[PDB]
Amino acid sequence: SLPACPEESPLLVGPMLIEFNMPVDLELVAKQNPNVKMGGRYAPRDCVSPHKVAIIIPFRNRQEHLKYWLYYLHPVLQRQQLDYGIYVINQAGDTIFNRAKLLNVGFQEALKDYDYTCFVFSDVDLIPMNDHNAYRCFSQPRHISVAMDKFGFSLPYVQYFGGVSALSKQQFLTINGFPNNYWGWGGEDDDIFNRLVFRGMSISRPNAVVGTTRHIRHSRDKKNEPNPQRFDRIAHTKETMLSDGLNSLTYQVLDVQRYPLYTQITVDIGTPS
Ligand SMILES: CC(=O)N[C@H]1[C@H](OC[C@H]2O[C@@H](O[C@H]3[C@H](O)[C@@H](O)[C@H](O)O[C@@H]3CO)[C@H](O)[C@@H](O[C@@H]3O[C@H](CO)[C@@H](O)[C@H](O[C@@H]4O[C@H](CO)[C@H](O)[C@H](O)[C@H]4O)[C@H]3NC(C)=O)[C@H]2O)O[C@H](CO)[C@@H](O)[C@@H]1O
Ligand SMILES: NCCCCCCOP(=O)(O)OP(=O)(O)OC[C@H]1O[C@@H](n2ccc(=O)[nH]c2=O)[C@H](O)[C@@H]1O
Ligand SMILES: [Mn+2]
């Protein structure tokens, strides 16, 4: 009996002040966000959103960044009127980071909770400066973080698909998900771009002003060295995507924590094979 939410949310306020020098307290954030339910889940109570969104954050040893993430995004995601949930996919162990494989785990585990039809993939240190930048899916793959301060407020190159993107369930299935074998920093986002193109898709983007985004300045994490094989790997995506992705994924979930502002899935994703 509830009516559809308006196509564009009327709650948005546009540009926002984003700051990272104060301390953050999640208990207080939870208090400020009383409609967010256990596990970081929220749907509007006045209308039915067509946007059923799981937001998936690749994670390890970035608790501080996450606190800022949750403090900023949660009010924004509720103003966007999304039926959404937050998933921090936390890599067990202390071997080489695998961002793309975590994202695949997130897609697959979130679908177990709820009929999501849209997946936002977001680095933990990226905060949107304009709530008009929609954190939901379009009829093409959607690059969200298009004007990052760290790149001078534009794309570093026109095929850049990193940072924060969104893919419908179908788009993500259509490319066999992300590659599993990009270990250490770099390239997996380019591979994902290649995949979308090889499947007849193109990148949808908001304008540069609306897609203005802040990156929390930070230094190198240990265990995520530039993958020296990345240039070779993005050159062969068309062949490798056929059998590297969802259809070749395994992993072992060690732990599932329902915090008030997010679900954290701690997962053993192994080492390079
Ligand atoms: C596929 C990929 O890497 N994709 C990522 C994309 O990469 C763009 C380049 O990033 C440079 O590092 C930047 C970084 O992007 C930025 O975030 C940060 O702020 O500044 C960094 C440093 O300026 C990176 O250095 C570069 O790597 C070099 O690429 C060249 C040409 O493509 C390649 O030939 C180099 O390899 C070396 O070549 C030299 C130079 O002649 C010597 O022969 C060396 O011996 C040889 O290794 C690469 N250099 C190095 C040091 O590896 C690109 O990776 O960027 C986006 C956004 O950052 C990512 O999200 C993409 O995944
Ligand atoms: N000028 C100083 C340069 C320091 C460069 C380090 C690379 O920085 P970025 O290019 O932002 O990538 P990144 O933030 O390290 O990795 C991307 C994302 O992967 C995640 N990630 C990466 C490594 C890690 O140990 N933990 C983690 O959670 C996190 O979501 C992060 O936002
Ligand atoms: Mn970063």
From Swiss-Prot:
Required co-factors: Mn(2+)
EC number(s) stated in the UniProt entry for this protein: 2.4.1.-, 2.4.1.38, 2.4.1.22, 2.4.1.90
Annotated binding of Mn(2+), by residue: D125, H218
Catalytic activity: D-glucose + UDP-alpha-D-galactose = lactose + UDP + H(+); an N-acetyl-beta-D-glucosaminyl derivative + UDP-alpha-D-galactose = a beta-D-galactosyl-(1->4)-N-acetyl-beta-D-glucosaminyl derivative + UDP + H(+); N-acetyl-D-glucosamine + UDP-alpha-D-galactose = beta-D-galactosyl-(1->4)-N-acetyl-D-glucosamine + UDP + H(+); a beta-D-GlcNAc-(1->3)-beta-D-Gal-(1->4)-beta-D-Glc-(1<->1)-Cer(d18:1(4E)) + UDP-alpha-D-galactose = a neolactoside nLc4Cer(d18:1(4E)) + UDP + H(+)
GO cellular component, one term: protein-containing complex
Expression by tissue: Ubiquitously expressed, but at very low levels in fetal and adult brain.
Pathways involved: Protein modification; protein glycosylation
Ligand binding (N-acetyl-D-glucosamine): G187, E188, D189, D190, R230
Keywords: Cell membrane, Cell projection, Congenital disorder of glycosylation, Disease variant, Disulfide bond, Glycoprotein, Glycosyltransferase, Golgi apparatus, Lipid metabolism, Manganese, Membrane, Metal-binding, Secreted, Signal-anchor, Transferase, Transmembrane, Transmembrane helix
Protein modification: The soluble form derives from the membrane forms by proteolytic processing.
Domain of life of the source: Eukaryota
Recorded family membership: Belongs to the glycosyltransferase 7 family.
Self-association and partners: Homodimer; and heterodimer with alpha-lactalbumin to form lactose synthase. Interacts (via N-terminal cytoplasmic domain) with UBE2Q1 (via N-terminus); the interaction is direct.
Identification of the protein by name: Beta-1,4-galactosyltransferase 1
